[PDB]
Every structure is written in structure tokens, then in C-alpha cells.
Amino acid sequence: ALLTSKEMRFSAAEGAKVLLSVPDNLLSFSWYKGKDVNENFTIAHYKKSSDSLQLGKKVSGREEIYKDGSMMLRAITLEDTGFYTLQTFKGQQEVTHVHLQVYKI
Amino acid sequence: ALLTSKEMRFSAAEGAKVLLSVPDLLSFSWYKGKDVNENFTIAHYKKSSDSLQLGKKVSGREEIYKDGSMMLRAITLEDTGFYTLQTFKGQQEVTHVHLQVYKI
């Protein structure tokens, strides 16, 4: 059925914090490292039904996940630059492609 | 203020699913091991903002529920050891949950 999609671009400074927030009724969501929704690259998978969160393997330990799908990042490094994908369920699927570019200053 | 504490013991078979649950909030934290050191965090849930802070001892096989329970899946026998739950309420409870894995 439906499938909405988006692209964004956030900026962040080394050693600083960023909020990857996306303006989107919701059933579950998942964050992946990169532009692709692949299950081997998950950070976290929230399930509104179970009010739980399943951890992925691309967790760095500098991430905070909120229940509106927002994700906070801390202690940013030049390695933190790249893509991160948010998949929202409702049946619908939303796919937000969040880009992060880190700069030195 | 208060400081209650407990120790528990769960068993599970290699490659299966287990639930580490504790009888219960403002926040809680799961650590890999018996030591409450933040370099050892698995996850820190904060009931006030209803968010979740991921730690550096995340292996990627954990699920966190809002009663402080942590489910483990795809267990690999390397996960035998301690796992600690620190609950914030006002009091603090500290549970040292041991987990034992079998090959079955």
C-alpha cells in the first residue's frame, strides 16, 4: 500500500550534540545506519504496542532515542557523518533519510 | 535516600530467548556486569522524558521493556556473567541479575 519518503540534512560540530528530528498516528519505528532500511544495520526498533525497544548492532553508546521517533546524538566525531534512516509504521511506511555532516570548528 | 538491593539468577539455553525481570519509576539503567560504572552501561531509560539512552555495552541482542526487564535473544554462551539493574524512584534499588547459559 502506502509508502511515504523524505530526505533531510542536519549539521553538527565535533564534540557537540545533535537532534535528528523528523516531522511525520504511529505503530512502530526503526533507525538504521545509512540510507537503507536493512535489518542488519538497526540502531533501535520501537514497538508502541509493547512499549519496548529492541537494540541494533550499530549502537555506538552516544545515542538517545525518544518515542516520537526523535534521535539525539552526543560526543559527535568526524566518523559520525553519514546517513541514518527512520522507518515509521502507519498500513503505511514512512521512510525519512536523515543525513548528518560533521564539521570541525 | 533509601537503598534496597537484591540478587537473582536466571538460566537459558544457547541460541534461545530469555527475560530478565525484576519486581518494581523515574529512570533505570542496565549495565553489563555487577559494577555500576557508566562505561559499562547497556541502556538508561528515563521515565520523565520517556526516552532511552543507549550504552557502550550494547551487543545488539537486547530488548528493553518499561518495567525494567531486559530480554536477551540469540544467546551465545559468552553472555554468562552478571547484568545489573539500577532503579531510580525517592529511593534506589540495585539488582545483580546473574544469567547462566546452557548448550542444550
Best to test chain A binding among B45, B54, B79 (most A CBs inside 10 Å): B54
Residue B71, min C-alpha distance to chain A (Å): 9
CA separation for the pair B22, B86 (Å, rounded): 11
Whether B86 and B34 have beta carbons less than 8 Å apart is answered as no
Whether B22 and B8 have beta carbons less than 8 Å apart is answered as yes
Whether B83 and B30 have beta carbons less than 8 Å apart is answered as yes
How is A35-99 classified by DSSP, letter by letter? SS--GGGEEEEEETTTTEEEE-S---S-EEE-TTS-EEE-S--GGG-EEEEEEEE---EEEEEEE
Sheet with B70-72, edge to edge strand ranges: A4-13, A93-103, A82-89, A28-33, A42-47, A52-55, B62-64, B70-72, B18-20
Whether A56 and A32 have beta carbons less than 8 Å apart is answered as yes
Q: Which residue of A has its CA nearest to B59?
A: A57
3-class secondary structure, A12: strand
* 8-state DSSP, B56: T
Residue A59 phi/psi, 5° resolution?
Answer: -80, 125
Whether A80 and A88 have beta carbons less than 8 Å apart is answered as no
Q: Which residue of B has its CA nearest to A69?
A: B51
Please name which of A38, A19, A54 lies closest in space to residue A95, comparing C-alpha atoms.
Answer: A38
* CB atoms near residue B19 (< 10 Å): 12
The amino acid occupying position A102 is V
Radius of gyration of chain A (CA): 13
3-class secondary structure, B104: coil
CA separation for the pair A50, A18 (Å, rounded): 28
Q: Give the helix/strand (H/E) hosting A4.
A: strand A4-13
Architecture of the CATH domain B4-104: Sandwich (2.60)
CA separation for the pair B71, B66 (Å, rounded): 12
Buried b (16+ CB within 10 A) or exposed e, A16-50: eebebbbeeeeebbbbbbeeebeeebbbbbbbeee
Cα distances (angstroms) measured from residue B19 to each of B2, B8, B29, B31 = 27, 12, 16, 15
**Domain A4-105 in this protein, CATH class:** mainly beta
Buried b (16+ CB within 10 A) or exposed e, A86-98: bbbeeeeebbbbb
User: Which residues, 6 or more positions from B11, have their beta carbon under 8 angstroms from its beta carbon?
Assistant: B99, B100, B101, B102
3-class secondary structure, B40: helix
**What is the experimental method?**
X-ray
C-alpha cell at B75: 544467546
